[PDB]
Amino acid sequence: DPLQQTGQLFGGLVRDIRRRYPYYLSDITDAFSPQVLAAVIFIYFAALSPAITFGGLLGEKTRNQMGVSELLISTAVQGILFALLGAQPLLVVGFSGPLLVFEEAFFSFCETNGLEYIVGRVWIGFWLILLVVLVVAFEGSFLVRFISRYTQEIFSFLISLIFIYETFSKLIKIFQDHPLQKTYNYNVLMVPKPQGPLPNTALLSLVLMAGTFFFAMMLRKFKNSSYFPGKLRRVIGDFGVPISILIMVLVDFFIQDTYTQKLSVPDGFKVSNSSARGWVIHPLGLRSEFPIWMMFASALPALLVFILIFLESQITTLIVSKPERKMVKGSGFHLDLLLVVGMGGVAALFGMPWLSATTVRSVTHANALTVMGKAQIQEVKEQRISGLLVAVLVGLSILMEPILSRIPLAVLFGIFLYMGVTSLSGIQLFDRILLLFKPPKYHPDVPYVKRVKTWRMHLFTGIQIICLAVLWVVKSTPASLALPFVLILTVPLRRVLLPLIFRNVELQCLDADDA
Amino acid sequence: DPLQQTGQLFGGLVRDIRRRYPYYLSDITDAFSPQVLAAVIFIYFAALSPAITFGGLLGEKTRNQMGVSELLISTAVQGILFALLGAQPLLVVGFSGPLLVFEEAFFSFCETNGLEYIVGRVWIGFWLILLVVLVVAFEGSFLVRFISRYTQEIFSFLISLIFIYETFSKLIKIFQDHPLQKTYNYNVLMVPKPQGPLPNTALLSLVLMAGTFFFAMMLRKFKNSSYFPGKLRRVIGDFGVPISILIMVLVDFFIQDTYTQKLSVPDGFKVSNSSARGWVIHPLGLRSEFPIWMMFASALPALLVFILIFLESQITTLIVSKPERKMVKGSGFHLDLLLVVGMGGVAALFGMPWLSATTVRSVTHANALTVMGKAQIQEVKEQRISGLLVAVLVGLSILMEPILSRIPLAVLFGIFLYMGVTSLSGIQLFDRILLLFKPPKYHPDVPYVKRVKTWRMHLFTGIQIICLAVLWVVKSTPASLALPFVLILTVPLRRVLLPLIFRNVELQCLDADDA
Ligand SMILES: CCCCCCCCCCCCCCCCCC(=O)OC[C@H](COP(=O)([O-])OCC[N+](C)(C)C)OC(=O)CCCCCCCCCCCCCCCCC
Ligand SMILES: CCCCCCCCCCCCCCCCCC(=O)OC[C@H](COP(=O)([O-])OCC[N+](C)(C)C)OC(=O)CCCCCCCCCCCCCCCCC
Ligand SMILES: CC(C)CCC[C@@H](C)[C@H]1CC[C@H]2[C@@H]3CC=C4C[C@@H](OC(=O)CCC(=O)O)CC[C@]4(C)[C@H]3CC[C@]12C
Ligand SMILES: CC(C)CCC[C@@H](C)[C@H]1CC[C@H]2[C@@H]3CC=C4C[C@@H](OC(=O)CCC(=O)O)CC[C@]4(C)[C@H]3CC[C@]12C
Ligand SMILES: CC(C)CCC[C@@H](C)[C@H]1CC[C@H]2[C@@H]3CC=C4C[C@@H](OC(=O)CCC(=O)O)CC[C@]4(C)[C@H]3CC[C@]12C
Ligand SMILES: CC(C)CCC[C@@H](C)[C@H]1CC[C@H]2[C@@H]3CC=C4C[C@@H](OC(=O)CCC(=O)O)CC[C@]4(C)[C@H]3CC[C@]12C
Ligand SMILES: CC(C)CCC[C@@H](C)[C@H]1CC[C@H]2[C@@H]3CC=C4C[C@@H](OC(=O)CCC(=O)O)CC[C@]4(C)[C@H]3CC[C@]12C
Ligand SMILES: CC(C)CCC[C@@H](C)[C@H]1CC[C@H]2[C@@H]3CC=C4C[C@@H](OC(=O)CCC(=O)O)CC[C@]4(C)[C@H]3CC[C@]12C
Ligand SMILES: *[C@@H]1O[C@H](CO)[C@@H](O[C@@H]2O[C@H](CO)[C@@H](O)[C@H](O)[C@H]2NC(C)=O)[C@H](O)[C@H]1NC(C)=O
Ligand SMILES: *[C@@H]1O[C@H](CO)[C@@H](O[C@@H]2O[C@H](CO)[C@@H](O)[C@H](O)[C@H]2NC(C)=O)[C@H](O)[C@H]1NC(C)=O
Ligand SMILES: CC(C)CCC[C@@H](C)[C@H]1CC[C@H]2[C@@H]3CC=C4C[C@@H](O)CC[C@]4(C)[C@H]3CC[C@]12C
Ligand SMILES: CC(C)CCC[C@@H](C)[C@H]1CC[C@H]2[C@@H]3CC=C4C[C@@H](O)CC[C@]4(C)[C@H]3CC[C@]12C
């Protein structure tokens, strides 16, 4: 087991290398599959869009101190490094909502306190490098031992729902921007974007999304059907999302007059606001002399950023490397943590955003490399090339502007809805949420359906709904940086509060290590 | 069996009455079900829309000699009479494409020959009354004996596909009328209809259609699922189309500014062009003296109209009253023919259109009254009230303008696509069309799948595709009135040409009386 404390300094880190690095020739050769390319194409669009979206939000929020150009380069470099050196290469390292919320907060703080933001982040980075080295030394990734199914399901479900809400909210904004009016203006300026409302924009975006999600779900049904020969059915099934994108990007292309929002990458590989910084950020300061109180006080925001990245990344590794998912090579919690957080700290010196192993992408990436027979899982295509290629392509996104500039965001939203829905598959919580509606006669005949009474099973599912609700309120409120700390409290709940009200026999079956 | 020649004058007609009329108290009381109301609501919109659409086409094609007001009254009166007196009340008596094509042709003829069209049709009616009485006397509905599965499947499949094509063609016309343009005019006049193109009209029509068809198909899946209690799941399942219409009619209502095409009934119960006729049509003439050569020569167009109505109605009765479908009361081919054609002839005297037992509606009506368990059919809800209520409501459609004027045609198209798709269910031809794509290992294990070799089964399916193609070309070409005569040639094909190239053992299994 990786979670056993070796008792020797960097004992986990050594064992995590000695576990996976023998299977490195396999990690390159296991990628020799069309399913692995079909994964790259899908997970590239999954990786790029947030690097464009969050990068755009970063720019307008931080006065272009950090923007799309920075985040595209960071996502690419860290993704390439992690793909090659990671103990679990199926982890997709990218920027997230919690990380955006911090960059917002640290900027807002730096403006009020009159500090260089981009220089301020360099010291957040130096602490993260010191703090991860200190944690990996003493084998602090052994505390991922204590994070049970209970916590993993609540998280995986919360992050999957947030993703679906975020996807739908982006569609609503198009209808809010381009409402269904009786009359419009046709002297409107599209200098940076449609200055005023346009006809046919919002309904076409709705159709483009719906059509993309439809074809994606139908081509998944087709994959696990008894139509057409097995090879052709599998090949077309494996390229479910790539076909769904191609079909509906072509639908958009042949519609001439009507406007849709397209993927807009930067002009070239340039810093977002040269008037505010270069590439390499000087710790002692750029314009004004950087003060000494912040150089030590940076530890507190660095400890917060560490928790955000640790919780998200380590829980993503648990969910991806579950026993039920046929992962033979095995994940290394020490090596993965050392890279993700370590690289993030080094990235801050170059004024680029630190990243995390994002759940929906990592989950989706693993799912894109999972084979199906008869239905159950035979084996997952465990390799470093899919994660590498996605990172390299995100880096090259600036150069391949002509290809991306024709692809609408409407199509991408249909793929995010598919990602959001598909990510719920192997969550026992979601499986038990469906049993609340199903009568007890037509239950799946699994242990917690058999061993535990129907009202006891639904009560346990009831506690996880109450957690998700609290987690969703904490996400909504200004205190959104405290969601990792609220997520941690699910471990006490399972270990202290549940065994009081629930019997152990029920909990062992409901919350099991294997299915 | 109803198809046995009694050998006594009106022997079939008597036996058809003596079969069903004992079960008349059941025909009233079997309707006491919410499924039967859910059938009325669905089949009312199925019955009304063509009575509006064909009625509108009749008006512009015949200079309002026959219009919507006429067809709404005819569909209502004949539907009410047939519902009460019919041997198979599940037959929905309405106007069809083949009947429109004749009214076109007879008008075009009457203009060239300088004859009173509406007066000319009165003599077509008098012959139909004489010709049906002559056929029913000598038991000519015994020739429906010779119409096998082969012919019934080709027809049922052709009429189902034409319906789907007609539904999609109506959507294309909206995009052709209201294209996706960059700029529009907003001094456009909507006096009788949008004089020029509008924004958001066509894409909303597409969404409204797609949404209606989606919910309809999902609520059918829900009906035959293991989610929510059995009664609630069945009730909501039974009201699948009524809910699907309500949801998407409300979506249209809350969209204020954007225009959609709505159901437009006439102002009141008035003749379409009083300047050209009254209610009762004088056989000897209205304006000019009606000639004697046409009074005898009317037999030829009356013989053509008879074949059109006979083939369509008698084949619809076969398809509806199959052994597979649990129809205990039994259909009467003599009584049903005597009413449909007889009423049509009497209707012509009042300058109203003669009708036929339309397949998709009749099939859909039977399907709307069919229960499902475990899945197989237990029993069909055989009653006269569903057919009666649909006819009465079509009659009242003129009075309930406020309710219909809010319902868009876009929603109705989603229900026609559902009708078109659902009508293919119990067609062995369609079942065998799917086996062309499926590998032979995953075949349904039914007699023709086992007894007959895979390439022989697919060859037989190949002959029926070639028939459908020829039937579709005959439908497209100017000679569309000859489609009944081309459909009749499938009976020789099965009886003469197939037993030459196919063995009897194969044909008996492929073309079986029961499944
Ligand atoms: C697997 C099957 C394929 C997927 C299903 C696709 C079927 C087709 C559905 C079509 C969409 C129908 C609903 C939208 C109706 C039109 C909206 C509109 O015009 O409103 C404008 C309104 C305008 O709001 P307003 O009214 O406040 O604007 C006022 C403005 N003035 C005053 C100027 C007029 O905008 C919206 O908010 C519309 C949002 C649309 C939301 C619909 C999302 C549908 C996407 C697919 C859903 C997926 C289902 C998941 C379940 C299955 C999971 C496995
Ligand atoms: C149970 C399934 C749930 C429902 C599935 C459907 C999901 C939702 C899909 C949304 C529609 C996406 C496809 C259309 C793309 C947009 C069209 C457009 O804007 O083009 C304009 C074009 C413009 O063409 P044009 O030729 O006028 O363009 C020339 C331009 N001018 C005039 C300026 C010179 O118009 C069309 O022709 C589009 C018509 C719509 C296409 C048909 C839609 C089908 C919807 C139902 C399908 C159901 C699935 C059946 C299979 C399953 C059966 C069980
Ligand atoms: C922040 C950036 C610069 C990354 C910093 C990573 C270092 C903390 C790593 C990189 C290589 C590591 C070393 C790689 C190999 C070993 C041998 C290892 O030997 C054993 O005792 C292993 C025996 C076994 O259990 O098999 C002891 C730790 C050590 C020195 C490691 C200590 C931690 C090091 C220096
Ligand atoms: C590395 C392979 C696998 C391709 C995938 C990633 C590359 C497309 C990216 C990763 C980081 C990028 C680099 C990040 C920073 C810079 C500095 C940038 O600035 C300069 O040196 C020019 C002068 C100036 O701006 O001051 C020029 C582009 C370059 C080399 C970028 C070019 C594109 C790179 C190599
Ligand atoms: C919407 C707000 C209140 C956010 C909080 C989340 C709710 C959706 C939670 C709060 C309490 C939960 C309930 C607490 C206890 C139960 C009993 C539990 O088992 C039963 O006693 C009924 C089932 C059976 O008898 O088999 C079923 C779920 C349910 C209703 C839970 C469903 C989800 C609820 C309503
Ligand atoms: C002419 C218009 C108004 C349409 C009506 C068609 C007529 C030609 C039908 C309507 C009622 C029919 C009659 C209904 C009942 C009978 C009794 C029937 O009596 C028997 O021979 C016994 C039947 C048996 O026991 O089998 C003979 C046919 C007859 C006169 C039928 C002959 C054909 C009739 C007149
Ligand atoms: C009562 C229900 C169950 C019957 C079925 C539906 C009704 C709403 C329809 C069926 C036929 C319709 C009738 C068909 C023809 C006429 C003649 C029409 O005559 C006139 O224009 C006025 C008198 C004249 O000027 O000659 C008046 C409406 C009326 C009675 C219609 C009223 C509505 C009726 C009864
Ligand atoms: C639409 C236009 C082109 C009108 C013509 C109709 C075609 C669609 C028909 C004409 C001949 C038909 C084919 C003739 C023979 C066969 C082989 C038959 O299978 C076999 O006999 C061998 C395959 C096996 O081993 O099962 C399957 C149907 C098919 C393709 C037929 C169905 C489709 C075809 C091309
Ligand atoms: C690019 O950076 C410049 C500074 O390098 C930004 O200018 C600042 O603007 C804010 C308010 O918008 C002021 O509070 C600062 O005093 C300005 N700084 C200086 C010295 O100019 C500018 O906002 C940035 N623009 C972009 C691209 O976002
Ligand atoms: C109603 O019917 C009248 C009678 O045919 C139509 O009026 C005729 O119009 C045509 C040209 O369309 C002329 O050639 C005739 O001289 C007109 N006849 C009479 C007596 O008016 C009228 O077009 C029809 N209108 C409707 C409602 O379709
Ligand atoms: C750019 C956007 C709009 C769409 C991009 C999707 C592209 C890359 C996808 C869509 C369909 C895909 C193809 C689908 C099937 C196969 C067969 C397989 O044996 C080799 C790869 C190949 C030939 C795929 C290559 C990549 C492909 C062309
Ligand atoms: C007019 C158009 C837009 C929509 C018309 C559909 C109406 C008539 C339909 C939609 C949903 C239907 C209801 C659905 C379920 C039930 C429960 C059943 O036990 C009694 C009938 C009742 C209460 C139905 C009555 C008719 C109903 C209200």
Contact indicator for B72, B87 with CB cutoff of 8 Å: no
For β-strands A376-380 and B92-94, DSSP reports them as unpaired
Range of the domain at A59: 11-422
Element holding B433 (H helix, E strand): helix B428-435
Number of neighbouring beta carbons within 10 Å of residue B453: 10
Determine which residue's CA is closest to atom 17 belonging to ligand 2: A251
Residues with Cβ within 8 Å of A457's Cβ and at least 6 positions away in sequence, in order, are A432, A435, A448, A449, A510
Which ligand 11 atom is nearest residue A249's CA? 3
Residues with Cβ within 8 Å of A136's Cβ and at least 6 positions away in sequence, in order, are A10, A12, A13, A334, A337, A338
Which ligand 2 atom is nearest residue B218's CA? 1
Mutate which of B14, B132, B334, B339 for ligand 6 pocket (most atoms within 8 A of beta carbon)? B14
Does A438 contact B186 at a Cβ distance shorter than 8 Å?
no
Which ligand 2 atom is nearest residue B175's CA? 35
Query: Of the candidates B181, B206, B257, which has its C-beta nearest A181's C-beta?
Result: B257
Residue B344 CA to residue B346 CA, distance in Å, equals 6
Name the 3-class secondary structure at A357: strand
In terms of domains, do A222 and A145 share one? yes
Measured in Å, residue A362 CA sits from the centre of ligand 4 at 26
Contact indicator for B64, B107 with CB cutoff of 8 Å: no
* Nearest one of B473, B430, B464 to B150, comparing CA atoms: B464
Any B CB within 8 A of A438 CB:
yes
Mutate which of A14, A85, A306, A336 for ligand 3 pocket (most atoms within 8 A of beta carbon)? A14
Q: Is residue A337 part of a domain?
A: yes
Which ligand 2 atom is nearest residue A248's CA? 15
Measured in Å, residue A353 CA sits from the centre of ligand 9 at 20
Q: Is residue A151 part of a domain?
A: yes
Q: Is residue B222 part of a domain?
A: no
State this model's resolution in angstroms: 3.0
* Nearest one of B345, B289, B403, B309 to B123, comparing CA atoms: B345
Measured in Å, residue A121 CA sits from the centre of ligand 4 at 21
Instruction: Report DSSP letters for B380-432, one per residue.
Output: E---SHHHHHHHHHHHHTTTTHHHHTTSBHHHHHHHHHHHHHHTTTT-HHHHH
Gaps in chain B with C–N over 2.5 Å, residue before each: 374
Which ligand 4 atom is nearest residue A80's CA? 3
Measured in Å, residue B308 CA sits from the centre of ligand 7 at 29
Number of neighbouring beta carbons within 10 Å of residue A411: 27
Residue A177 CA to residue A488 CA, distance in Å, equals 39
Element holding B465 (H helix, E strand): helix B454-476
Query: Of the candidates A182, A210, A257, which has its C-beta nearest B181's C-beta?
Result: A257
Q: What is the DSSP letter of B282?
A: P
Measured in Å, residue B428 CA sits from the centre of ligand 8 at 17
Number of neighbouring beta carbons within 10 Å of residue B105: 15
Any A CB within 8 A of B255 CB:
yes
* Nearest one of A488, A436, A487 to A458, comparing CA atoms: A436
Q: Which of A422, A444, A476 is the last residue of a domain?
A: A422
Q: Is residue A515 part of a domain?
A: no
Residue A388 CA to residue A368 CA, distance in Å, equals 15
Mutant choice from A178, A182, A187 vs B, greatest count of B C-beta within 10 A: A182
In terms of domains, do B162 and B299 share one? yes
Please compute Rg for chain A using Cα positions. Answer: 23
CA A231 centroid distance within chain: 31
Q: Is residue B180 part of a domain?
A: no
Report the pocket of ligand 6 as residue ranges, CB < 6 Å. Answer: B 8, 10, 14, 133, 342
Query: Of the candidates A186, A226, A434, which has its C-beta nearest B442's C-beta?
Result: A226
In terms of domains, do A462 and A399 share one? no
Q: Is residue B171 part of a domain?
A: no
Q: Is residue A55 part of a domain?
A: yes
Does B200 contact A180 at a Cβ distance shorter than 8 Å?
yes
> Count of residues for chain B?
515
Q: Which residues of B touch A203 (CB under 8 A)?
A: 200, 203-204, 206-207
Q: Closest-CA residue in chain A for B199?
A: A199
Contact indicator for B157, B487 with CB cutoff of 8 Å: no
Q: Which residues of B touch A229 (CB under 8 A)?
A: 439
Going from the C-alpha of B76 to that of each of A176, A368, B354, B412, the distances in angstroms are 46, 57, 12, 20
In terms of domains, do B461 and B379 share one? no
Contact indicator for B333, B13 with CB cutoff of 8 Å: no
In terms of domains, do B356 and B444 share one? no
Any A CB within 8 A of B439 CB:
yes
Measured in Å, residue B6 CA sits from the centre of ligand 6 at 14
C-alpha angle A343-A349-A352 in degrees, rounded to nearest 5: 70
Contact indicator for B458, B436 with CB cutoff of 8 Å: yes
Element holding A247 (H helix, E strand): helix A240-253
Number of domains within chain A: 2
In terms of domains, do A417 and A436 share one? no
In terms of domains, do B334 and B445 share one? no
In terms of domains, do B480 and B344 share one? no
Does B206 contact A207 at a Cβ distance shorter than 8 Å?
yes
Q: Is residue A164 part of a domain?
A: yes
Going from the C-alpha of B464 to that of each of B429, B430, B493, B496, B508, the distances in angstroms are 8, 10, 10, 15, 16
Q: Which of B406, B437, B461 is the last residue of a domain?
A: B406
Q: What is the largest CA-CA distance in chain A?
A: 73
Residue B369 CA to residue B353 CA, distance in Å, equals 28
Ligand 1 within 6 A of CB of B376: no
In terms of domains, do B105 and B137 share one? yes
Query: What single letter denotes the amino acid at residue A53?
Result: T
* Nearest one of B427, B493, B415, B513 to B155, comparing CA atoms: B427
Min Cα distance A505 → chain B (Å) is 28
In terms of domains, do A120 and A182 share one? yes
Mutant choice from A200, A233, A436 vs B, greatest count of B C-beta within 10 A: A200
- Partners of residue B376 on adjacent β-strands: B373
Any B CB within 8 A of A181 CB:
yes
Min Cα distance A443 → chain B (Å) is 9
Residues with Cβ within 8 Å of B418's Cβ and at least 6 positions away in sequence, in order, are B212, B213, B216, B217, B241, B244
Report residue B81 as tokens: 């009479």
CA A445 centroid distance within chain: 33
Mutant choice from A175, A190, A201, A203 vs B, greatest count of B C-beta within 10 A: A203
In terms of domains, do A454 and A411 share one? no
Min Cα distance A416 → chain B (Å) is 20
Residue A297 CA to residue A455 CA, distance in Å, equals 51
Mutant choice from A180, A204, A260, A434 vs B, greatest count of B C-beta within 10 A: A180
Burial pattern A274-303, b for ≥16 Cβ within 10 A else e, equals: eebbeeebeeeeeeeebeeebbeebbebbe
CA B425 centroid distance within chain: 16
In terms of domains, do A438 and A401 share one? no
Any A CB within 8 A of B180 CB:
yes
Report residue A105 as tokens: 């907060």
Q: Which residues of B touch A248 (CB under 8 A)?
A: none
Please compute Rg for chain B using Cα positions. Answer: 23
Which ligand 4 atom is nearest residue A398's CA? 8
